[PDB]
Nucleic acid binder design. Sequence first.
RNA 1: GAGGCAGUAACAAUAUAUGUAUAGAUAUAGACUAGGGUUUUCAAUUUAUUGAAGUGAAUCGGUGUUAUAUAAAA
RNA 2: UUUAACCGUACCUAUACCGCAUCAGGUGUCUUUGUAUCAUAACAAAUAUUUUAAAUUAAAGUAAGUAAGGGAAUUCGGCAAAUUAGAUCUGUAACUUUGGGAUAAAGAUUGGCUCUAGCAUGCUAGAACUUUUACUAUGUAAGGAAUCUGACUGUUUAUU
RNA 3: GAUUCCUACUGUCCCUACUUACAAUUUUGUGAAACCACGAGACAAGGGAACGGGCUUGUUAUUUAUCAGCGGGGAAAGAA
RNA 4: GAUACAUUUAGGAGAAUACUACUCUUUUAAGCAGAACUGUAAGAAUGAAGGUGUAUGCCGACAUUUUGAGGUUACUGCUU
Lengths: 52, 102, 134, 51
Amino acid sequence: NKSEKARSMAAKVLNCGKNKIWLDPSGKEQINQVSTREQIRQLIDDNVIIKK
Amino acid sequence: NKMMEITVNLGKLTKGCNWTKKASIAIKKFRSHLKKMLKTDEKITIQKDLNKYIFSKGLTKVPRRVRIKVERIADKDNAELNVIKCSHVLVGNFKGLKTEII
Amino acid sequence: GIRKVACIGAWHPSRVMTTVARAGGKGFHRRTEINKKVYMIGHGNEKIKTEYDLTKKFITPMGGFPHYGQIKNEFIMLKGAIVGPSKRVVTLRKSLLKNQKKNEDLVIKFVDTSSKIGNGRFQTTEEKRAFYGI
Amino acid sequence: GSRKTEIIKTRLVRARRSNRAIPAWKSELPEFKDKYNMKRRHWRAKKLKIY
RNA sequence: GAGGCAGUAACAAUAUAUGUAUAGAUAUAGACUAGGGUUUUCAAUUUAUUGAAGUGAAUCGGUGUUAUAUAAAA
RNA sequence: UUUAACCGUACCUAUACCGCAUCAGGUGUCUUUGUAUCAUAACAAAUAUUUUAAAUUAAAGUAAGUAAGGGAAUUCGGCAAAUUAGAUCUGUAACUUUGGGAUAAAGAUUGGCUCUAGCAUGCUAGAACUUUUACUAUGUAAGGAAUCUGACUGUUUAUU
RNA sequence: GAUUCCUACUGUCCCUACUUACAAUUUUGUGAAACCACGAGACAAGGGAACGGGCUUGUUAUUUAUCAGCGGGGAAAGAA
RNA sequence: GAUACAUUUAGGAGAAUACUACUCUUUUAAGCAGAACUGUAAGAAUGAAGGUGUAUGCCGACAUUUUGAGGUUACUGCUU
Ligand SMILES: [Mg+2]
Ligand SMILES: [Mg+2]
Ligand SMILES: [Mg+2]
Ligand SMILES: [Mg+2]
Ligand SMILES: [Mg+2]
Ligand SMILES: [Mg+2]
Ligand SMILES: [Mg+2]
Ligand SMILES: [Mg+2]
Ligand SMILES: [Mg+2]
Ligand SMILES: [Mg+2]
Ligand SMILES: [Mg+2]
Ligand SMILES: [Mg+2]
Ligand SMILES: [Mg+2]
Ligand SMILES: [Mg+2]
Ligand SMILES: [Mg+2]
Ligand SMILES: [Mg+2]
Ligand SMILES: [Mg+2]
Ligand SMILES: [Mg+2]
Ligand SMILES: [Mg+2]
Ligand SMILES: [Mg+2]
Ligand SMILES: [Mg+2]
Ligand SMILES: [Mg+2]
Ligand SMILES: [Mg+2]
Ligand SMILES: [Mg+2]
């Protein structure tokens, strides 16, 4: 359950707040293996991590 | 196995409680009300769209009446035990509606 | 605080006397009062007619008594206030005193039957529908 | 406070090094089987007085 | 070193049958200096313990001049 | 152009400072969106945090409201609370160190909609129609007549 | 700044009544201090260091071992 | 103290309640009706001191009719 690492890193990439990020519970498996900035930018394009 | 439909007004149940917590009290009084009717003492569970409708005005105010449907389902812990689930039913005008058995 | 008594006792005697006022429970006591006059004796199902009215009516007001309902039995009607709330046992007995003073007769003109819930303006149900005209 | 002189940084580096527990390779020896450090400090409790 | 008073005074206590979400609730927020000194980041075990990694300057501060015989990080 | 040396560059602005503490106290400078016909006050954005006992029923407390008739009779003393208040137009006394007193005191007007009339073109006068009548959610002077003392603006026993 | 009188105004008063929130009354968790010669039930009079809880003659309480209030007394506690 | 009887519970309601205790008990709650409180709902049509200009067309505070209407049950009684 590495949810807190995803919320904080994705806030830096888009220059946005933490409360606007919406994770997707369907793609639960892919988020537990993130470690780089590069893997996040593919997750935004697949609309697993979207902005409110 | 038969289903029910009841109309329950929360303005009668929550008359004269402290208004700082009127929505949150209206859930606990709602649970003890159906234990009065149904004699069975297993449990009473609430669907999420029913819970969201009660908190629609805020903590201080509670809407007047609501229309519900009640059924008995199986438990998520033991297969042979049971539990009771409640769900919301949309209706505009409450005049003339009686409790029916599906 | 304000709603209290200031001094309880003096120095000597160095105890608190039983005559002072002290806070405690109230109500549900037993009382007994005398000299209540009897005005009317009858039955609830019957209609009571006087001389000074033209209409005849029952004893139960419109919408019933509050928290009671209707009267379907024999009853008594007496003057004044009576101990206790509604729907509780009340014991009636004869008087101990003798040499009661003679008075004159009792002439009852009419008995009221309006609704006791709100401000009621009508006596019977026929006066209500003749007013609005259905 | 991100503006230090030369002496303040050299003293602060040495004070970080001395706050450590006993290493694990020494604790297996018979001399230091149950012995533990007593001169540790906490950064919120006690202050270092360096200025 | 250990009693009575005493588990007494005094403080803390949001909703959901399936949830990395749907709602409720309180508080304006962000940068330089003085002070603090590894609290930073990550991994493993449960505002803790141990172990690694992390601070890059010709043009951003000091090092220069003086305040009528030791003075400026505005 | 193997020319431009030496030192600091992580992080916290208050649950990462000082008050023996995860203390309702204290601490230099700057920046910060929208409605708001003088402003103020207030609300919303932005951003950051947060999980599960009971209740139409005590007494006496700490706060906030309302009151028939009388109106300071309570009390050392009108202590506490209440009344007045914005803006436009009339009107303004005794006294005087001739500057003031004075915003003295005392009256009248105030919404919404449809137009007319000026020129400076967004400000000001007037008219007709209509209603359970208009600064009042927030903010906003009680007034008058005398006596003792200090000329005035200013300062003082950090903690009676 | 200190003092007296008129007008308006009002629960200051005659004489108090009603409603709401937070603490209190009921439950779970963390969990102290002042004070303590002995206190094992309480009074009337007496003498006594001339105002007794205990001494001397008299009159008297008692719910299976409680709970919530109150400020008469312990010449109540603080400070040679 | 006398005369009868016993080794006598669980869940709800209030005329009873700080927690205990008390008075009663097998029917819970919707919808109608009786009886009341507020004072005329939304929508629709017809008007309106006027104003624009041609489209018998747009913009108008408010008024009348549908309407003693609409809404609610800290009082009694019916029905499934
Ligand atoms: Mg109440
Ligand atoms: Mg420094
Ligand atoms: Mg508390
Ligand atoms: Mg660490
Ligand atoms: Mg840096
Ligand atoms: Mg930095
Ligand atoms: Mg600061
Ligand atoms: Mg500190
Ligand atoms: Mg603080
Ligand atoms: Mg209460
Ligand atoms: Mg009055
Ligand atoms: Mg009056
Ligand atoms: Mg007087
Ligand atoms: Mg007097
Ligand atoms: Mg005053
Ligand atoms: Mg006008
Ligand atoms: Mg002076
Ligand atoms: Mg002083
Ligand atoms: Mg409370
Ligand atoms: Mg004695
Ligand atoms: Mg004597
Ligand atoms: Mg006690
Ligand atoms: Mg001495
Ligand atoms: Mg009793």
